[PDB]
Amino acid sequence: MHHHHHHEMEKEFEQIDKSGSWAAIYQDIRHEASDFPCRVAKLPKNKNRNRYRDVSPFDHSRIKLHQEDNDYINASLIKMEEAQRSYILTQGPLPNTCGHFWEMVWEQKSRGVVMLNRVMEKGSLKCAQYWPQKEEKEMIFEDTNLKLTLISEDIKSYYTVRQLELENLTTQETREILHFHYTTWPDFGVPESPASFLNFLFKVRESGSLSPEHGPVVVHCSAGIGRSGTFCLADTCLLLMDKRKDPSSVDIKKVLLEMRKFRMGLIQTADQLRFSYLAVIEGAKF
Ligand SMILES: NC(=O)[C@H](Cc1ccc(C2=CC(=O)NS2(=O)=O)cc1)NC(=O)[C@H](Cc1ccccc1)NC(=O)Cc1ccc(C2=CC(=O)NS2(=O)=O)cc1
Ligand SMILES: CCCCCCCCO[C@@H]1O[C@H](CO)[C@@H](O)[C@H](O)[C@H]1O
């Protein structure tokens, strides 16, 4: 990628931004977004497994738990072919689905978990605390054979990184799970700056949590679509620029619509779309 690519990219952002065109672009994405059945998510017995009735995983891409009783979890597999990366986007676990959440992490062989929301937002519980606190580092999930222990916790200004140990109580196998928690990303909003977001994304990448040597990273916010979608779109577009002969050929609208074939509503505001674009052009420099 040469300087002319950077030039066109930056000029384009400026042109879109100065004319406030994000609004129209975002509307077109919403208007063209695909729709597929969500029959399983809507089954009566799955009512208490969904945080929002208007946010469901499509049947074709939903993540199935390996258990036979009820394999449903509100989670979707976002598989980006050209970029060669898979992500699992899920809702913030409910108190009764924290076990399911870790069963998914175990079954999919994930190494990292990216959390982009806070436990309480706008006065209500938007995500059950599914990881241990300092005073009780050990957790055992009801109706599961999984134990979770907090090994380390590093609290920074805009995010916190944790090392966790997940253990299968039946086989005694233990695995290191990295928790990347962005603690200052407002609901329906954007990160404080492209720099903070990029530092976070790069930290996730450097850990190996996004490598094909491990299962798909699990990403979530409250509904698993707005902030989670922004995070994944930026990472994927960055991947495409590093792989393509001509990085300026990346079509952000096309890429987002492709991701939306896997999970509904990815990116919830025009400003989040704008931020994704900004994060990509800023990250392209690195
Ligand atoms: N759309 C939204 O803002 C959020 C989801 C939403 C939340 C957050 C975000 C995020 C922004 C972000 O930046 N990141 S993010 O976390 O992804 C995006 C979307 N959805 C809602 O608030 C909807 C009510 C609604 C429906 C349609 C349109 C508007 C409101 N509320 C519910 O679904 C609660 C509810 C769930 C099940 C039932 C039930 C029906 C039933 O039949 N039985 S029941 O279980 O009681 C009844 C109520
Ligand atoms: C997510 C980041 C996507 C970056 C895609 C940038 C595509 C640049 O596109 C180019 O921008 C130039 C400057 O306006 C125009 O003159 C060119 O005709 C146009 O093809």
From Swiss-Prot:
> Which EC class is the enzyme in?
hydrolase
Protein name from the UniProt record:
Tyrosine-protein phosphatase non-receptor type 1
> N,N-(cysteine-1,S-diyl)serine (Cys-Ser) cross-link located where?
221-222
One GO cellular component term of this record is: cytosol
Q: Which residues carry this modification: N-acetylmethionine?
A: 1
The active site is formed by 221
Which keywords accompany this UniProt record?
Acetylation, Endoplasmic reticulum, Hydrolase, Membrane, Oxidation, Phosphoprotein, Protein phosphatase, S-nitrosylation
Q: What is the lineage of its organism?
A: Eukaryota, Metazoa, Chordata, Craniata, Vertebrata
The organism encoding this protein is Homo sapiens (Human)
Q: Which residues are annotated with the PTM Phosphotyrosine?
A: 26, 72
Q: Where does substrate bind?
A: 187, 221-227, 268
